[PDB]
Amino acid sequence: HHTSKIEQPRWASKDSAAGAASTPDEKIVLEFMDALTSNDAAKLIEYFAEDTMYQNMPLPPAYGRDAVEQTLAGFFTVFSIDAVETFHIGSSNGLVYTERVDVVRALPTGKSYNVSVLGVFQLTEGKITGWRDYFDLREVEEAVDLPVR
Amino acid sequence: IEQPRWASKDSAAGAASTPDEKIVLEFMDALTSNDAAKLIEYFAEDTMYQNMPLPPAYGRDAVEQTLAGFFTVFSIDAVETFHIGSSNGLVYTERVDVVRALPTGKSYNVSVLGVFQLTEGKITGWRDYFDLREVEEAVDLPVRG
């Protein structure tokens, strides 16, 4: 499957280091973003602590590493993440923030959508203890023609 | 507003540690004024605003118009910021905003993650990410055009 390059939004920072990971935890998160296109829950779960959580905010949260892995595996049964571009990354107080576009493709329909997402990650000892992505679900559902909620 | 299960137990996570973070928290406090003319004072001439499920506003005049339009329909009754952080001139806020739809009188606690760009202490960009359908269904108002 061919995926077109994600363009830079008008508002992308004039500060050229805004997309740069400047700490070990930010570097882990950018590596994790790169890994999302694997569509591989077993590969992804290695980034997570045992005590952890994951939530796409328009949907219910998963608590615990097993539940997070099951949620990811379920997601990749239906969707492919074809590309991720992180425009901005920053961090304070044990939390890392990423402003991104993720290209998501619904396997049942063949249709794709570039999702605007702002995400937050909590890390302890270099492992993810929380990951929440915020975006509008209805826009995704309408674009890929697949109800998710 | 209840504390989310996932919110940091360290109150440093929600406290400003830099001048830009301090400005953003002051701005969050100001939102309950519901006053676009007051709020626009925080914005640079070169700026933008977008509630991500809706069209963006570019330039200070358009931002003020968009804010004014918003406050004719909604009141912001409270803002609680659980987490605030920053790097490279951008501030991030994980919040709940209590919004009330004026036509129906119904309120909803919106989970929002927002980003602010600042230059010389003024807002050059503000984008809030959240699910719009949840808000519309809770307050009985079909916001999106």
Curated annotation (Swiss-Prot), chain A:
Sample GO molecular function, one term: limonene-1,2-epoxide hydrolase activity
Pathway the protein contributes to: Terpene metabolism; (4R)-limonene degradation; (1S,4R)-1-hydroxylimonen-2-one from (4R)-limonene: step 2/3
Taxonomy, superkingdom: Bacteria
Conditions for induction: By growth on monoterpenes.
Catalyzed reactions per annotation: limonene 1,2-epoxide + H2O = limonene-1,2-diol
Subunit organization: Monomer.
Identification of the protein by name: Limonene-1,2-epoxide hydrolase
Swiss-Prot record, chain B:
Molecular functions per Gene Ontology: limonene-1,2-epoxide hydrolase activity
Known catalytic reactions: limonene 1,2-epoxide + H2O = limonene-1,2-diol
Enzyme class: hydrolase
Residues the record marks as active site: D97, D128
Effect of N51A: Almost no activity
pH dependence: Optimum pH is 7.
Cited InterPro entries: LEH, NTF2-like_dom_sf
Family: Belongs to the limonene-1,2-epoxide hydrolase family.
Role, per record: Catalyzes the conversion of limonene-1,2-epoxide to limonene-1,2-diol. Can use both the (-) and (+) isomers of limonene-1,2-epoxide as substrates and also has some activity with 1-methylcyclohexene oxide, cyclohexene oxide and indene oxide as substrates.
Subunit structure: Monomer.
Name of protein: Limonene-1,2-epoxide hydrolase
Gene name linked to the record: limA
